Design an enzyme around this catalytic site. Structure first.
Site, PDB file in Angstrom:
ATOM      1  N   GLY C  10       0.805  -1.207   0.000  1.00  0.00           N
ATOM      2  CA  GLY C  10       0.000   0.000   0.000  1.00  0.00           C
ATOM      3  C   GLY C  10       0.842   1.263   0.000  1.00  0.00           C
ATOM      4  N   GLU C  71      -1.778   0.024  -7.413  1.00  0.00           N
ATOM      5  CA  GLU C  71      -1.686   1.091  -8.397  1.00  0.00           C
ATOM      6  C   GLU C  71      -0.263   1.629  -8.393  1.00  0.00           C
ATOM      7  OE1 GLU C  71      -1.672   4.728  -7.881  1.00  0.00           O
ATOM      8  OE2 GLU C  71      -1.479   4.685  -5.685  1.00  0.00           O
ATOM      9  N   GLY C 143      -6.204   1.555   4.509  1.00  0.00           N
ATOM     10  CA  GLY C 143      -6.128   1.437   3.069  1.00  0.00           C
ATOM     11  C   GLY C 143      -6.815   0.183   2.560  1.00  0.00           C
ATOM     12  N   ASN C 206      -1.355   7.292  13.690  1.00  0.00           N
ATOM     13  CA  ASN C 206      -1.049   8.514  12.954  1.00  0.00           C
ATOM     14  C   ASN C 206      -1.361   9.755  13.775  1.00  0.00           C
ATOM     15  OD1 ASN C 206       0.145   7.697  10.542  1.00  0.00           O
ATOM     16  ND2 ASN C 206      -1.821   7.386   9.507  1.00  0.00           N
ATOM     17  N   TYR C 224       3.098  13.729   5.246  1.00  0.00           N
ATOM     18  CA  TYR C 224       3.446  12.317   5.356  1.00  0.00           C
ATOM     19  C   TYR C 224       4.950  12.124   5.472  1.00  0.00           C
ATOM     20  CZ  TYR C 224      -1.306  10.688   4.487  1.00  0.00           C
ATOM     21  OH  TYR C 224      -2.654  10.412   4.597  1.00  0.00           O
ATOM     22  N   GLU C 254      13.077 -13.848  18.928  1.00  0.00           N
ATOM     23  CA  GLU C 254      13.260 -13.225  20.233  1.00  0.00           C
ATOM     24  C   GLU C 254      12.184 -12.193  20.544  1.00  0.00           C
ATOM     25  OE1 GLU C 254      15.486 -14.418  22.158  1.00  0.00           O
ATOM     26  OE2 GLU C 254      15.265 -13.070  23.881  1.00  0.00           O
TER      27      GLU C 254
END
Ligand SMILES: Nc1nc2c(ncn2[C@@H]2O[C@H](COP(=O)(O)OP(=O)(O)OP(=O)(O)O)[C@@H](O)[C@H]2O)c(=O)[nH]1
Ligand SMILES: Nc1nc2c(ncn2[C@@H]2O[C@H](COP(=O)(O)OP(=O)(O)O)[C@@H](O)[C@H]2O)c(=O)[nH]1
Ligand SMILES: COc1ccc(CCc2nc3cc(OC)c(OC)c(OC)c3s2)cc1O
Ligand SMILES: [Ca+2]
Ligand SMILES: [Mg+2]
Lengths: 431, 155, 437
Positions: C10, C71, C143, C206, C224, C254
């Site tokens: 994505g 895309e 997404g 986010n 971003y 681990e």
């Protein structure tokens, strides 16, 4: 998701359809001959969405012109951008539809639809990734409504995996008092509810009111109305044709805007509202743009959003402006008018910005809303349809073409169910 | 039986046929299955000449069909101002009510025939007339947000 | 040694991957074309960074990474970007039409177009590995490709590599920087179908990253790139033990041992400190005790929640830079007494500590000022359930009306999977309750 195939049928479909190409072409540097003559490099990134690039560096619109009346095709070529279209993409019949939906859907339109599908097939085969189909038409006429919904149905079968998008002009007694138009519209709505993914409802009622009362144009003309249509279409397609941060397509718009399959009729809004040869005052601020685009007076569908509730909203701000100033003003209108946004759909307002402004404006805001207040548009059409159908007025025009009176009842019954569905989610609560 | 031929002539607008049929004894007040008369059909399709001819030879200006529709009802629905003028001049019931509780003012306002709304009002149209749903002509204008009509109903 | 293959799915996973590998090369002294001047072995050496980089015959170090997206607009920028010559050209795989923010398209309709090609390319990298440990998968929750295709890829990887470990770096949605209204749907769907095929998943909210850029880095409207370059700093601290001579978390196995007590509660909370603005390039260095105390401040958390509302099941302190072990033991000794940091009654009340003595690297053009010592605390706390609750609530508000559900049913998906995904989430919040909170 790259190419969009444009289709415009009937007198109204080709009128606003031509204005659409004259606008976006001016905004992309394409001249009436197809040659690029712009000064910006961002106006060719997503150019392939609407234009086929000819080998001679030319750019030709990927549009198909249809009409059962040859008189409309001639006026198109005389228009400025008349020669930019592919001459093969003109599919015009001999005898018109006579403002008869049945004539456009079952008889004369049926004889021409096959010829139109061949041109549509050609445009689709030479596509890298067909995004969908875009149709401009009116619902109160004969060709755009009758043959338009026929094409939609036929294209839905041949291209079931593509998006169906329409710019449907709604009839109104303020522009043309033809009592059969409620017939043609109710029958077309039944088709649009079943075979399209997105429909922009351009209401002549609202277009007239804007020019008459807001723009103070006593005798509004079709050019004055289409001036608003071309501005609305340009805004609602700005994010499809320009790069920006979004890279939006017709499917992502539908996925996030249509919460329920049948509730896909959008209420467009624009700001600032201007007239031909106006552009008065000194633009307007972001806070002014926000309050105007949510105002009922700036809506292209004769509906009051404060009489309903928004299910989804998409706002595009075109021009040089503080993206921060947009985020707060959008945030204020939502917390202020928190009641007019459904609580069961979190974050139902999306905002985008495009530095390229629309050509005689520096600041502009286009709005796309999926509000339950759109039921007022269908109620108005249903009230006029029922008033005509109860007296069975002019029904022989349609029955004489093979139609059955049960198709009228089925059409009205379906449109009333659509109004019921809007009222459902207008009074529903999370609880 | 020139009755069905006169009804068909009035509907089509063939003035000459209407004159000949009436000359052979055609019933000016003939009715079809639903009860429509030649005056109903001539007014519904805007044949002003045939409307007057019928009204000059004994046509019932306030005749009703099975649904209670009068010639003025249909003329006010389709938006034929001139025919509305003539009908009212010959004694048409301006406040005639049909099976749906609708008056001529209801239909003219629903179809946006503003000028016909003014004529019906100046001739005593009942603004308090309610339909089967209790809506007056003003209620319809307020429900559909027709400011132009709303201003007219507030004479 | 033992190799690790990174998978980026994505737009979020690919752009996050771009930042991570941009930072990796700097930390390991690799140029944007794979050239490393200070490498003893020219055509292959069992070094530390060798786990993440393969070596060709001409001394070119190629990352063991795969970039996938339905895309091409995003991956095409990697092909023409600064690192065009860095990755395997055949490891940048792209389709034509994306998932349209629809989990069903990414997992069913569109995802099936390219699932086989992505697995074949992964096998190409795997066959180059002598001892493949597992995969590091990067993707977003909201997404259409990051959720639908990721679960499809994870399901396939479980069958073809049933013995390998799989770690996630999942992007938790936030309204401040969102992209779609159906993101809550996709989040529940991918988490449901992935909870079983994953060993450890590090969520990155986010909104938390957004708040840190605006509050600690003085960025009005973070982009971003700002969020990613900061995220890559957290990922770099988590994968540091894999790319260097790690004494704590030496291999993917681990991670579960130290952080995941139970296979289903494998969502550790990450806390990074210090995050100082690059404009304040002349700030006093924070001691080991000061940056260690900052880890227990909610402002530095990667996922918005309240660790004081839940019990701890594990805690790892990954220090980097000029950090003396004596100061770490002293700082932890004070945390065990001062703060009411409550562990579960069945887990040792200890702190796993690893130290990478390499100074933290900041990307040129980045917004973080270079510090001389930092720390990333990986703590498995039941307070993370709060983030699951907020997500489930937004899911419930929409699914109650069955809104947008028709888009998923029309893309080869059944409505029963919605109730299934929600039932699995309800079973997760309860699992967090049965351990204390
Ligand atoms: N941290 C961070 N988050 C991102 C970035 N890009 C997108 N996102 C987040 O990802 C979510 C949407 O998922 P995407 O990865 O963009 O969608 P996709 O994987 O390309 O799949 P499609 O729906 O088919 O486009 C949004 O909530 C964004 O906040 C990024 O560069 N950094
Ligand atoms: N805004 C606008 N509306 C139009 C235009 N032309 C026709 N209409 C509307 O469309 C309806 C008539 O349909 P029309 O397109 O003319 O019939 P068709 O040729 O068979 O498609 C009427 O309600 C008009 O108000 C136009 O140029 N602009
Ligand atoms: C309601 O919540 C959401 C709705 C949609 C989305 C993304 C998809 C979008 N596609 C377009 C396309 C547009 O024109 C072609 C357009 O107007 C110019 C748009 O508005 C700016 C958008 S928004 C995300 C949401 O969270
Ligand atoms: Ca080596
Ligand atoms: Mg994407």
């Amino acid at each position: 998701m790259r190419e969009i195939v444009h289709i415009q049928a009937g007198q109204c479909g080709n009128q606003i359809g031509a204005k659409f190409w004259e606008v976006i072409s001016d905004e992309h540097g394409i001249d009436p001959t197809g040659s690029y003559h712009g000064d910006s490099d961002l106006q060719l990134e997503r150019i392939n969405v609407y234009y086929n690039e000819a080998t001679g560096n030319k750019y030709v619109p990927r549009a198909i012109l249809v009409d059962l009346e040859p008189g409309t095709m001639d006026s198109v070529r005389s228009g400025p951008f008349g020669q930019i279209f592919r001459p093969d993409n003109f599919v015009f019949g001999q005898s018109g539809a006579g403002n008869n939906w049945a004539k456009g859907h079952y008889t004369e339109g049926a004889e021409l639809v096959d010829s139109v599908l061949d041109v549509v097939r050609k445009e689709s085969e030479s596509c890298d990734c067909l995004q969908g189909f875009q149709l401009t038409h009116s619902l109160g006429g004969g060709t755009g409504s009758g043959m338009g919904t026929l094409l939609i149905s036929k294209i839905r079968e041949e291209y079931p995996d593509r998006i169906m998008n329409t710019f449907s002009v709604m009839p109104s007694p303020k522009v043309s008092d033809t009592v059969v138009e409620p017939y043609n519209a109710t029958l077309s709505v039944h088709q649009l509810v079943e075979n399209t993914d997105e429909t922009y409802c351009i209401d002549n009622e609202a277009l007239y009111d804007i020019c008459f009362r807001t723009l103070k144009l006593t005798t509004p003309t079709y050019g004055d109305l289409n001036h608003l249509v071309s501005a609305t279409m340009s805004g609602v397609t700005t994010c499809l044709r320009f790069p920006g941060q979004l890279n939006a397509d017709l499917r992502k718009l539908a996925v996030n805007m249509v919460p329920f399959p049948r509730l896909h009729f959008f209420m467009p809004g624009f700001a600032p509202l201007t007239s031909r040869g106006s552009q008065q005052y000194r633009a307007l601020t972001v806070p002014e743009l926000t309050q105007q685009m949510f105002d009922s007076k700036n809506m292209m569908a004769a509906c009051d959003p404060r009489h309903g509730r928004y299910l989804t909203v998409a706002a595009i701000f075109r021009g040089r402006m503080s993206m921060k100033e947009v985020d707060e003003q959008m945030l204020n209108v939502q917390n202020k008018n928190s009641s007019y946004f459904v609580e069961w759909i979190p974050n139902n307002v999306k905002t985008a910005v495009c530095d390229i402004p629309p050509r005689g404006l520096k600041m502009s805001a286009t709005f796309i809303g999926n509000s339950t207040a759109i039921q007022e548009l269908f109620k108005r059409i249903s009230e006029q349809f029922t008033a005509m159908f109860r007296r069975k007025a002019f029904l022989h025009w349609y029955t004489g073409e093979g139609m059955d009176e049960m198709e009228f009842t089925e059409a009205e019954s379906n449109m009333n169910d659509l109004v019921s569905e809007y009222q459902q989610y207008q009074d529903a609560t999370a609880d | 039986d020139l009755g069905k031929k006169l009804l068909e002539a009035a509907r089509a607008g063939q003035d000459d046929e209407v004159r000949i049929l009436m000359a052979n004894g055609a019933d000016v007040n003939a009715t079809d299955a639903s009860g429509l008369t030649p005056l109903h059909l001539a007014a519904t399709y805007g044949h002003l000449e045939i409307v007057e001819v019928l009204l000059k030879h004994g046509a019932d200006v306030n005749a009703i069909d099975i649904m209670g529709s009068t010639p003025l009802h249909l003329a006010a629905l389709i938006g034929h101002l001139e025919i509305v003028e003539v009908l009212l001049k010959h004694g048409a019931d301006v406040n005639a009510v049909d099976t749906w509780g609708d008056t001529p003012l209801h239909l003219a306002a629903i179809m946006g025939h503003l000028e016909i709304v003014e004529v019906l009002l100046k001739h005593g149209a009942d603004v308090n007339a309610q339909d089967k749903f209790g809506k007056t002509a003003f209620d319809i204008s307020i429900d559909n947000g027709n400011e132009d009509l709303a201003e007219i109903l507030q004479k | 040694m033992r190799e690790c293959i990174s998978i980026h799915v994505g737009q979020a996973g690919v752009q996050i991957g771009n930042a991570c590998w941009e930072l990796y090369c700097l930390e390991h002294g690799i140029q944007p074309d794979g050239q490393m001047p200070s490498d003893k072995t020219i055509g292959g050496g069992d070094d530390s960074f060798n786990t993440f980089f393969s070596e060709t015959g001409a001394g070119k170090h190629v990352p063991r990474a795969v970039f996938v997206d339905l895309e091409p607009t995003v991956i095409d920028e990697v092909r023409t970007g600064t690192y065009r010559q860095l990755f395997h050209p055949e490891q940048l795989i792209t389709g034509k039409e994306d998932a349209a923010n629809n989990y069903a398209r990414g997992h069913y309709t569109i995802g099936k177009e390219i699932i086989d090609l992505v697995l074949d390319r992964i096998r190409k990298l795997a066959d180059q590995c002598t001892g493949l440990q597992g995969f590091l998968v990067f993707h977003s929750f909201g997404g259409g490709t990051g959720s639908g295709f990721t679960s499809l890829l994870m399901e396939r990887l479980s069958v073809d590599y049933g013995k390998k470990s799989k770690l996630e770096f999942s992007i938790y949605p936030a309204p401040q920087v969102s992209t779609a209204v159906v993101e809550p749907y996709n989040s529940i769907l991918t988490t449901h179908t992935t909870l079983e095929h994953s060993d450890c998943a590090f969520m990155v909210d986010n909104e938390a990253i957004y708040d840190i850029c605006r509050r600690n880095l003085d960025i009005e409207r973070p982009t971003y790139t700002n969020l990613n370059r900061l995220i890559s700093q957290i990922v770099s601290s988590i994968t540091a033990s894999l790319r260097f001579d790690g004494a704590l978390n030496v291999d993917l196995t681990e991670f579960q041992t130290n952080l995941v007590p139970y296979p289903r509660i494998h969502f550790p909370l990450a806390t990074y400190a210090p995050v100082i603005s690059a404009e304040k390039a002349y700030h006093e260095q924070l001691s080991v005790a000061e940056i260690t105390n900052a880890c227990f401040e909610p402002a530095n958390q990667m996922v918005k929640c309240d660790p004081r509302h839940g019990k701890y099941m594990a805690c790892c302190l990954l220090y980097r830079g000029d950090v003396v072990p004596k100061d770490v033991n002293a700082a932890i000794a004070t945390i065990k007494t001062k703060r009411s940091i409550q562990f579960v009654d069945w887990c040792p009340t200890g702190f796993k500590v690893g130290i990478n003595y390499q100074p933290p690297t900041v990307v040129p053009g980045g917004d973080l000022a270079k510090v001389q010592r930092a720390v990333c605390m990986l703590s498995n706390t039941t307070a993370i359930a709060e983030a699951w609750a907020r997500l489930d609530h937004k899911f419930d508000l929409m699914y109650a009306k069955r809104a947008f559900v028709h888009w998923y049913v029309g893309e080869g998906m059944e409505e029963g999977e919605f109730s299934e995904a929600r039932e699995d989430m309800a079973a997760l919040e309860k699992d967090y309750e049965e351990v204390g909170v």
